Amino acid sequence: NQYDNDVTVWSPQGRIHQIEYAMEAVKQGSATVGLKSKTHAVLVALKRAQSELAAHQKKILHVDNHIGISIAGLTADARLLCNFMRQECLDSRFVFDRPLPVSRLVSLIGSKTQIPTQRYGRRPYGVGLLIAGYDDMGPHIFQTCPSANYFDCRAMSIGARSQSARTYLERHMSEFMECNLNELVKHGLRALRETLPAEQDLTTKNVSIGIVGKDLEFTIYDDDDVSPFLEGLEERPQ
Amino acid sequence: MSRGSSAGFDRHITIFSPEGRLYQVEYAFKAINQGGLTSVAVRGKDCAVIVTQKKVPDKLLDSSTVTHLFKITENIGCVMTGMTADSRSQVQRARYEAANWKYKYGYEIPVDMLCKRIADISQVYTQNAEMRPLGCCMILIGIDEEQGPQVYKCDPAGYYCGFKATAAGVKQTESTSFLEKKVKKKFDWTFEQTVETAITCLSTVLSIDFKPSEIEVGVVTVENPKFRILTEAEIDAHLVALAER
Amino acid sequence: TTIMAVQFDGGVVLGADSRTTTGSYIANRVTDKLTPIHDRIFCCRSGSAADTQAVADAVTYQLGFHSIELNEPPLVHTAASLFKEMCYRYREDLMAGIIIAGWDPQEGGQVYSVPMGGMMVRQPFAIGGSGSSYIYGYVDATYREGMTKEECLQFTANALALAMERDGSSGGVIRLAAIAEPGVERQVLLGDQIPKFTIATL
Amino acid sequence: TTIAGVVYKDGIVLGADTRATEGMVVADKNCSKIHFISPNIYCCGAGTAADTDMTTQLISSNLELHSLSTGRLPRVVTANRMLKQMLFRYQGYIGAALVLGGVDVTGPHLYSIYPHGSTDKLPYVTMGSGSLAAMAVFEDKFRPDMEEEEAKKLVSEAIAAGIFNDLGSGSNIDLCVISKSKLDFLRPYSVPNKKGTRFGRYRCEKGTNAVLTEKVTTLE
Amino acid sequence: MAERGYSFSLTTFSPSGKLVQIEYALAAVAGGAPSVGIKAANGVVLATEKKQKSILYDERSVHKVEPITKHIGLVYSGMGPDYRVLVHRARKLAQQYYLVYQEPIPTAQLVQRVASVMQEYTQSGGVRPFGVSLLICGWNEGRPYLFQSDPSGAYFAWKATAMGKNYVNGKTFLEKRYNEDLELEDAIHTAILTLKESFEGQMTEDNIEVGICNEAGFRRLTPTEVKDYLAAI
Amino acid sequence: TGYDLSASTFSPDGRVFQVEYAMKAVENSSTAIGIRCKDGVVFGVEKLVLSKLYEEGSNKRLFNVDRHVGMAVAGLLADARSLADIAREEASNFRSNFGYNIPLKHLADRVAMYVHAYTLYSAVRPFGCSFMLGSYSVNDGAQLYMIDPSGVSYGYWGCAIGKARQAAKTEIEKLQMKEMTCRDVVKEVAKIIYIVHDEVKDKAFELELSWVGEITNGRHEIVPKDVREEAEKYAKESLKE
Amino acid sequence: MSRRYDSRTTIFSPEGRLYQVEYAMEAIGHAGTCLGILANDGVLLAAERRNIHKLLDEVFFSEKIYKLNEDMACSVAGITSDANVLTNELRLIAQRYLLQYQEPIPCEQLVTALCDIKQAYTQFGGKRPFGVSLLYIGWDKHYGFQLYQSDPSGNYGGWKATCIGNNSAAAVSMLKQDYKEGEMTLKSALALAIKVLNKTMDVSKLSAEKVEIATLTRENGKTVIRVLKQKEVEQLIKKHEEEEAKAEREK
Amino acid sequence: SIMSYNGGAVMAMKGKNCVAIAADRRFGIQAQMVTTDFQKIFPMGDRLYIGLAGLATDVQTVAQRLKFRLNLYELKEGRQIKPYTLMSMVANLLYEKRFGPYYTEPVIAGLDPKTFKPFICSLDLIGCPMVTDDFVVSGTCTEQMYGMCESLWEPNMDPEHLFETISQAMLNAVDRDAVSGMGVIVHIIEKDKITTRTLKARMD
């Protein structure tokens, strides 16, 4: 139709269709879950392999010693945004000699990604981000969207089939805050597993875990460092 | 070509129709009436008066902020008709142009010069395709030392002109015919007669008896060239004098 | 050049000499150094005539546009801030010492000094220019709190006369301006109207 | 250069000498230093002659545009404002020293304009290297509301003082009288100096000069 | 807000080889108020009709016959604000010429520069062509000049011509009335008669504007002079 | 027929349909109200909780744009956030240039003109948000302005924007807010917000409250937890009859 | 926005064609006839005058023939104001070369520079092309007398005899039949031009006020460019009429 | 100092219905002579000439740029430039470089086209024009030229007297200047013909 090609065209219903299509771009990606306790923020990303002979695509990126992200949607847009966030964190450490507070970084992201939603010939970023951070206010989980809106969350899941993960997180959100690190990671892993097909199970090949905490700088566990977190997982309840 | 002929994008951008018309400019003239208000300006022998319709439907609206009367300089006043935000942008541009003219040339801008400047700026919108013309009309009043009171009107087409009397808005055709009748039977217009003529024109074309809160009045006189907006007391005095006659 | 401004309860008094020199030549002996910035706001100017004239014109323009936009009489502090911004931004290119004095409904009578370099300070009274060095002791010994408009006018006239008698860069006539809520009253002291102080002989 | 101007009861009298020196040698014996700005505004110029000519030409052109646009007579204040803003933006690099005089709807006005962009509105002004002699004449003999003939005599006296006491001034006195009803461009107004009468006859005869080659091109 | 205009042409070639936008600008011109120019032996007369739509309009406020220099005059047929743009540009071009050469611009030179501006608007990005035709008169080297500049940017030198409404009939009338050796007074009479042919209603000294160019320069006729000429007719 | 695609195109009736579509975007957002009493301004927003996974205070629609000026928004939140950044920039630049706090009327005019600049061109899109600016000072009093996507700015005694603004305006009309103080206005604002909310259409919502006035020494701030809890209890009691 | 109102002037068509250039060529075909003929002792342009009206003031120098520098001249067909733009550009290019080398620009180099400008408008910028075809006549020390023709596409070529504008194809057929290479003189070339213009201007009879003729020759190491007077064209037309009458009498 | 780097002298003089313009012919760098036929007088029309003194590089540059602009002018307008218009064009060209000036001081001598009234003028290096009725000089020996011309010039000289006067002025002036001379070229412009002569001169 005539209203669904340009990001500068309002539809007669008060919507912008290009922004919703970028939202669909985020929904096409593989699932990822983020949750926080009193002291830790955990991202667990289900990685997807294009072929049987390919490595699983990286989903968790370093931003700074206290901030990491997991991505859904267009990977190159995610790399653009990650470079921007890294530059902001380095600017903060250069000027103020302090780590940039997470919510200020998320505000900068929202400001940067709102601009192309109003200018002709631009497009929205087609990437959704889960941002795990730790600062003076404790742990933080943030969700950023192609619409440039962002949410402070107790827990969140984005990507394909993320509604099941969101239901599980709804169920155990009351438990999350008093969990220790291993229990929190296991909650995230169960939520991520709820988005899997029946045949597929969580393995050290398709699971990536990012953790940040009070005394713990942001760390990524990919293949063999994931096994201690996978050990002890009960079989899928079905 | 044929009457009301169209070809290409002549109904969407400011390019010529086969008859040589600019449809977007005509649509902007209709945008003026979209506002739903009417204003009248009348030139006396020693004064110029602008009277605009003031409508405040709801009591939640702070009435003191609902004005179509603005002062551009100390001595130049204006009434705007049409789209409110376009009107306010044009008012800001006029204030800037006046201040800059004073700064560069060392004397206050004449009313005709300010009207011509605004008209040039809007002709630019009539000739460039990437922006729409403003949907507003500006009426300026002032006192020139050489020529007396001045009433000038500029429109979205970039056309401007000086007037003995003029009107803008929904009922401006009826207002113009009424003012034609009043100016044909020319008699010496004092300040009171000019104000009464403007108010009676608005009241007769809107077919309502007015109240001091329903209209807004601004004046410039030779005795006091400074532009001043009449308070509700002065307007009510004028309205009483008009009602008794 | 000697410029001076004094605050009293309901307004200010400004005063200046009228001498503009080029070296030892007096190029203008009746210079008007008291410049209206707005209806109740004046500036006294010292330093380069081109610089102060340009800056005063620019500030007049900005303050007038700002006052039209706000539909409010300008604050003396706002004019002083505009002068300060201009003088600080171009401190390497300008030689301008300004006194900004005037009346506000919100603040009353106000005197601000914007010396060379572009700092801004409010003072009970301010002096400036090359002649001002000779009257620092006099104004320190003479000024008292609670002077009326007439006392302020006499104080300013005496100080300016003393500076004009000592400073070769000052002279001519004394231009005074009293600014209050009712308006501005300007006067020129010339000839025998200028306060006289006998030269000590023998 | 000596240029001067006075305000008299009906208008402005501008005056100038007509000598232009290059270094310490007289280059131009009859230099026109009073410049048209508008039919009611004139300007005498001193300083860098090229700067003066170019600045006055530019302002005259801009004021002509302004008066065509407004359909009104130019004001002296407008010329003053344009000149001072242009000169200030150039920070004294354009070396034009101007005496700007005119009569507009507000009356007669006289300004001195300095190359750095400062102006003075005065009833009499002098400028140039002979400016102090002319100023001495003015301070000795100026009175307000002089008649036209009195003002012309006074300005010619001031220019003559510049001519006879400043090495950089000489030749003729040029006047420009401006009132609301007329403009008199008196050039020359006075000729106080003339070349001395020749007592002899230099040998200048046909055939005196030997020629190597010659070429005559006929024009159609 | 974004201040970037369009960079592509709005006037392009049709399959038959025509630029239709320029023809539509010409249609706008042909709908304009009649204008007449007549070049006499000792001057040029430009006469236009300005019949206001109401008595509320101040006739003296706006002018259609405009001076460009002391020796060049302008009149138009078409759209008035476009005319104001071109008048401002012509005055600036004449001033720049005077600044470079220190003599008044010859009429042909100014016509060429104005026509160049009009062509620019026929080709540049994001603009429509001007919707006016100009009649330009001037006096140079003891000689009168009359030119017409069209919205395409093409200009012609004329001995007598008409623009606007009923301009074909005006041209026929001119070519059956014009002769060489005509004086300026008789040319003024002929121009007023040409306006009268297409005029509707009574012609008064306020319904029309007349400018003349001779050795003394270009000037607009005051309504009293026009009234005298109308009485003579 | 293709007249509704750009803000640089007028419809034959003289309308700019892109601005009207942006206004429709505002009409679908949840309700925010502002009330100007004799000694301050109080803002109340009904913030819909779309997911229980969200934290409290996420996606807040009340902003501090200057020490003395608060902002209540409705519509596209990202547009509203960019406009809040614009308002902050305007206030800060005004303080830097003129040396005092920007008057609320001037800030409203500046931001409204910035908004209007996006209704003229095909190269940009009109903002899909409307908002209220609230301020208090001793010199200027209490002031409450509202700006819509077209760029129109008006002063108000009470204002509502969002999905249910007509019912909210009806509720506001029943108030004698000209003689009231901020303390009792906060209760009235909470009651109006609780009234206009639709529990069937929308499940859960937080009540965001803020105020500026002599109570806060002319500083816009979140209403303290005690007053907010008291106001919520009073509003819930008023719901029951 | 831009995209929906963009005419796309500088893009290929599915057949590999540039439509705006072809339509500009149609415009050229509409315009008045210009003819160029090269002889052994000079070169000439003969253009049909399309501004014919009794009320038109007499033209200053020529309606369609423009001197470009001391040694070159051109004639234009198509849009007139576009031709004004192009002739100003040509004069600027010639003077730039003269400033750089202190020698007059060779004719082909001037044509090539202008054709590069035309091609640039055909390839990028989104503007419409110039609707002008040009004939150039000139002399240089490299190739002597030269005649060139350039198109809105930016193509150019040198010719012995060529024609652009109205009825140019019939004129080219006449030239192919009648032009004699290596033996033309300015007199015979002028006669051929008069005959060609007689055929091409079939509707309107040849009169000296309907045509403009300019000749470029060499005298004493100078280049002389002259537009013929009305009486000279009248004499040429009279001579052509006599030739036709005698050829009829023989037949 | 910079203006004297190459030396050189140009002079123009007014006759009754004629003009004369003369220049020295030496091209040299400081004290060393390089050539003796350097052109300093350029024709800008049938009866209009400009002589340039100053830096030889700026002499050549200004002559070529003036020829550029004059050719464009005479193509746009189908007429020959008048001497006053040429003077204004030269002044505009020089003032365009107000702060980076060309180091030449032009002298213009000509007859009015269609009027044939003699015109002479000189300009300084930033383009301040000076029109006189008797003579103009430019170059490194202007004091000597002033002495000669002020002594010898007379009003209403016929072209032969004009030739003798300008010749004697130039010869005796450059005989007294170290870095000018090595020959003198004189142009006499009348309405019907132009006469070019080279004078017998000292070569030291």
- Give the resolution to one decimal, in Å: 2.2
Return d(Cα A116, Cα E3) in angstroms, integer: 17
Cα–Cα nearest to F19, from F124, F133, F150, F213: F150
Which residue from C129, C45, C51 is spatially nearest to C94, judged by alpha carbons? C51
Which chain F positions have a beta carbon within 8 Å of E126's beta carbon?
Answer: none
State how far residue D57 is from chain C, nearest Cα, in angstroms: 22
Q: Which positions of C are annotated as active-site residues? A: 1
What 3-state DSSP class applies to C180? strand
CA distances in angstroms from H178 to H174, H175, H201, listed in the order given:
8, 8, 14
DSSP result, B182-236: HHHS-----HHHHHHHHHHHHHHHHTS---TTTEEEEEEESS--S-EEPPHHHHH
Q: How far is CA B90 from the centre of its chain?
A: 12
Torsion, Cα of E5, E11, E12, E16 (10° steps): 170
Question: What is the rounded CA–CA span in Å between residue B92 and residue B242?
Answer: 35
First to last CA, chain B: 54
> Residue D178: which of D74, D104, D73 has the closest Cα?
D104
Phi, psi (degrees; rounded to nearest 5) at C181: -55, -45
- Show Cβ contacts of residue F217 under 8 Å, excluding neighbours closer than 6 positions: none
Distance from CA of G1 to the nearest CA of F (A): 5
What is the C-alpha to C-alpha distance for residues H25 and F133, in angstroms, rounded to an integer? Answer: 83
Give the separation between CA G195 and CA G46, rounded to whole angstroms: 11
Tell me the β-bridge partners of A60. Answer: A70
Q: Nearest 5°: phi and psi at H4?
A: -95, 5
Residues 6+ apart with CB under 8 A from C171: C17, C18, C19, C26, C29, C164
Q: Which of A59, A41, A39 is nearest to A49 (CA)?
A: A59
Q: Which residues pair with B148 in a beta bridge?
A: B144
**Are the beta carbons of H99 and H88 closer than 8 angstroms?**
no
* CB of H53 closer than 8 Å to CB of H66: no
Cβ-based interface (< 8 Å): residues of C facing D? 20, 25, 27-28, 30-31, 48-50, 53-54, 93
CA C178 to centroid of chain Cα atoms: 11
Which residues numbered 25-84 in B keep a CB inside 8 Å of some CB on C? 71-73
* CATH number of the domain located at residue range(s) G2-250 in this protein: 3.60.20.10
Of B113, B108, B114, the residue nearest B74 (C-alpha)? B108
Q: Which of C66, C86, C89 to mutate to test the interface with F (most CBs of F within 10 A)?
A: C66
Nearest-CA distance D48 → chain H (Å) = 9
3-class SS of residue A61: strand
Domain spans of chain G?
Answer: 2-250
CB pairs under 8 A between C and F: 23
The position carrying tokens 């605050």 is C7
Cβ neighbours of A223 (radius 10 Å): 14
Listed in sequence order, the residues at least 6 apart from B213 whose beta carbon sits closer than 8 Å to its beta carbon are B54, B56, B63, B232
Amino acid at E233: I
Contact across the interface for C53 and D116, Cβ inside 8 Å? no
Phi/psi-derived region of residue A148, left when phi > 0, alpha when psi is between -120 and 50, beta in every other case? left
Q: How far is CA F167 from the centre of its chain?
A: 16
> Which chain E positions have a beta carbon within 8 Å of B183's beta carbon?
55-56
Q: At what angle do helices B84-105 and F104-116 cross, to 10 degrees?
A: 110
CB within 8 Å of H127: residues ≥ 6 apart? D50, H90, H91, H92, H93, H94, H95
Residue whose tokens read 């006096």 = E139
**If residue F212 lies in a helix (H) or strand (E), which one and from where to where?**
strand F205-213
Give the ranges where A5-142 is alpha helix by DSSP (H): 17-28, 75-96, 102-114
Note whether E102 contacts D57, CB cutoff 8 Å. yes
Q: How big is the CA angle at F187 (ends F181 and F192), to the nearest 5 degrees?
A: 115
Contact assessment for residue F160 and residue F31, using Cβ atoms and an 8 Å cutoff:
yes
Q: Catalogue the long-range contacts made by G230-239 (C-beta closer than 8 Å, 24 or more residues apart).
A: G233/G208, G234/G207, G234/G208, G236/G190, G236/G191, G236/G194, G237/G194, G237/G206, G237/G207, G237/G208, G239/G191, G239/G194
From residue D121, alpha-carbon distances to B55, B104, C168, E170, G173 in Å are 52, 18, 23, 57, 81
Q: Which residue(s) pair with D3 in the sheet? A: D16, D127
Question: So where are chain B's domains?
Answer: 1-245
- For residue C118 the two structure tokens come to 């572009």
Residue in E91, E98, E99 closest to D68 by CB = E91
Nearest chain G residue to H76 by CA distance is G88
H or E element at residue F194: helix F182-196
C-alpha atoms less than 13 angstroms from C-alpha of H7 in its C-beta half-sphere: 23
Hey, what CATH class is E13-232 in? alpha beta
Phi then psi dihedrals of residue C6, to 5 deg:
-130, 135
CA dist F116 and D14 (Å) reads 54
- Find how far residue D24's CA is from the centre of its chain: 20
Number of independent structural domains in chain F: 1
Number of domains composing chain H = 1
What are the backbone dihedrals phi and psi of residue D148, each rounded to the nearest 5 degrees, phi first?
A: -65, -45
Asked if residues B183 and B198 have their Cβ atoms less than 8 Å apart, the reply is no
Longest dimension (CA), chain F: 56
Token pair in block for residue E201: 């209603």
Q: Tell me the CB-side half-sphere exposure of residue G179, using CA atoms within 13 A.
A: 23
**Residue F92, Ramachandran bin (φ over 0: left; ψ between -120 and 50: alpha; else beta):** alpha
* CA–CA gap between residue A63 and residue A152 (Å, rounded): 18
Burial label for G117, CB within 10 Å (0-12, 13-18, 19+), is middle
Q: What angle do CA B230, B234, B238 make, to 5 degrees?
A: 115
Concatenate the DSSP letters of all residues of C81-142 into one string: HHHHHHHHHTTTT--EEEEEEEEETTTEEEEEEE-TTS--EE-SEEEESGGGGGGHHHHHHH
The DSSP bridge partners found for residue F144 are: F134
Judging contacts by C-beta atoms under 8 Å, the chain E residues touching residue D69 are: 88, 91
Instruction: Identify each DSSP E strand in chain B by its residue range.
Output: 38-43, 47-53, 69-71, 77-82, 136-144, 148-154, 160-162, 165-169, 215-221, 228-229
- CA nearest neighbour of E29 among E115, E98, E130, E118: E130
**Residue type at F47 in one-letter notation:** K
The count of other CB atoms within 10 Å of the CB of residue A199 is 5
Tell me the two tokens of residue G9: 């002037």
- In angstroms, what separates the C-alpha of E121 from chain B's closest C-alpha? 10
The domain spans of chain C are 1-202
Q: Which SS3 state, helix, strand or coil, does residue G132 take? A: strand
Question: Using the 8-state DSSP alphabet, how is residue A65 labeled?
Answer: T
Both tokens of C34, joined, read: 């008291």
Any E CB within 8 A of B152 CB = yes
Flag if E102 and H88 touch (Cβ within 8 Å): yes
Query: Who among G27, G57, G126 is closest to E13 (CB)?
Result: G27
- DSSP class of residue A116? G
> Is G2's CB within 8 Å of E153's CB?
no
**Break sites following residues in chain A (C–N > 2.5 A):** none
Residue H87 CA to residue D56 CA, distance in Å, equals: 18
Count of beta carbons in the 10 Å neighbourhood of residue B7: 14
D210 located within any domain? no
CA distance E125 to chain B (A): 9
Ramachandran class of H116: left when φ > 0, alpha when ψ lies in -120 to 50, beta otherwise: left
Please name the member of D88, D114, D122 whose beta carbon is closest to the beta carbon of C54: D88
What count of residues does chain B have? 245
With CA atoms as reference, the chain C residue closest to F98 would be C78
How far, in Å, CA of B160 to CA of B168, rounded? 13
Contact list in G for residue B9 (CB cut-off 8 A) is 5
Chain E residues in contact with G129 (beta carbon < 8 A): 13
- Rounded CA-CA distance D67/B207 in Å is 46
Number of residues in chain A: 238
Q: What strand order describes the sheet that includes D11-17?
A: D124-128, D2-8, D11-17, D173-179, D183-190
Query: Which amino acid appears at position B12 of this protein?
Result: H
Q: Check if the beta carbon of residue H90 is closer than 8 Å to that of residue H75.
A: no
